[PDB]
Amino acid sequence: RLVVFPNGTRKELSADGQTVKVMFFNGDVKHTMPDQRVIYYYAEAQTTHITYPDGMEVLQFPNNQTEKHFPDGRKEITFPDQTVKTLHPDGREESVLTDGTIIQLNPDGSKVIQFNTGQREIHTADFKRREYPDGTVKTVYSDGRQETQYPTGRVRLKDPQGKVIMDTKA
């Protein structure tokens, strides 16, 4: 079949019967497949939008970025530089850089960086903290004080000039 609507939109079945092809008057194009997958091209935005039956949506942008919308509410963005950012329903954003570094932006204002080496940096308004696989924690406060927590339970606190003001262990 070919149907041409009064507004000039055309609905045409592919010759082999499998693809329903709508050519909208505004330049948009929609193909609907036998599995009910819908592929929609938006002409002005030059964007492709695929809707799967299970509700997943994938958008492909002309800058080469991809955005995938999961049934669990996550949205995963693949930038043109290959960075993959995941937006979680609770507001966390987690970027995985190509070298595998993970950068997490959290709703509370913090930024957490998980390096390949196992080290983890936590940045808040009040401190910058580094965590190490053995359990060591070094924290530098906005006022310049520095705390080292050792794997043993020992906690050593220094003033901003480096003088020890607290050194405790159970």
Residue numbers in the entry: 955 to 1124
Question: Mind quoting what the paper says about this structure?
Answer:
CPAP and STIL are strictly required for centriole assembly: STIL at a very early stage and CPAP slightly later, possibly by controlling the organisation and length of the centriolar microtubules. Our mutational analysis of the interface demonstrates a remarkable correlation between the ability of mutant proteins to bind to one another in vitro and their ability to support centriole assembly in vivo, providing compelling support for our structural model of the metazoan CPAP–STIL complex. These data strongly suggest that the interaction between CPAP and STIL is a conserved, essential step in centriole biogenesis.
The resulting sheet shows a twist of approximately 13° (i.e., the angle between the consecutive, hydrogen-bonded strands), slightly lower than the average value of 20° observed for typical β-sheets. Crystal packing interactions involve only small protein interfaces, suggesting that the protein is biologically active as a monomer. The structure of the TCP domain represents an unusual, novel architecture. The TCP domain structure lacks a defined hydrophobic core typical for globular domains, and both sides of its β-sheet are exposed to the solvent and well hydrated. However, what, to our knowledge, makes the TCP domain structure unique amongst naturally occurring proteins is that it solely consists of a freestanding meander β-sheet that entirely lacks a defined hydrophobic core and is not flanked by other globular domains that pack against it.
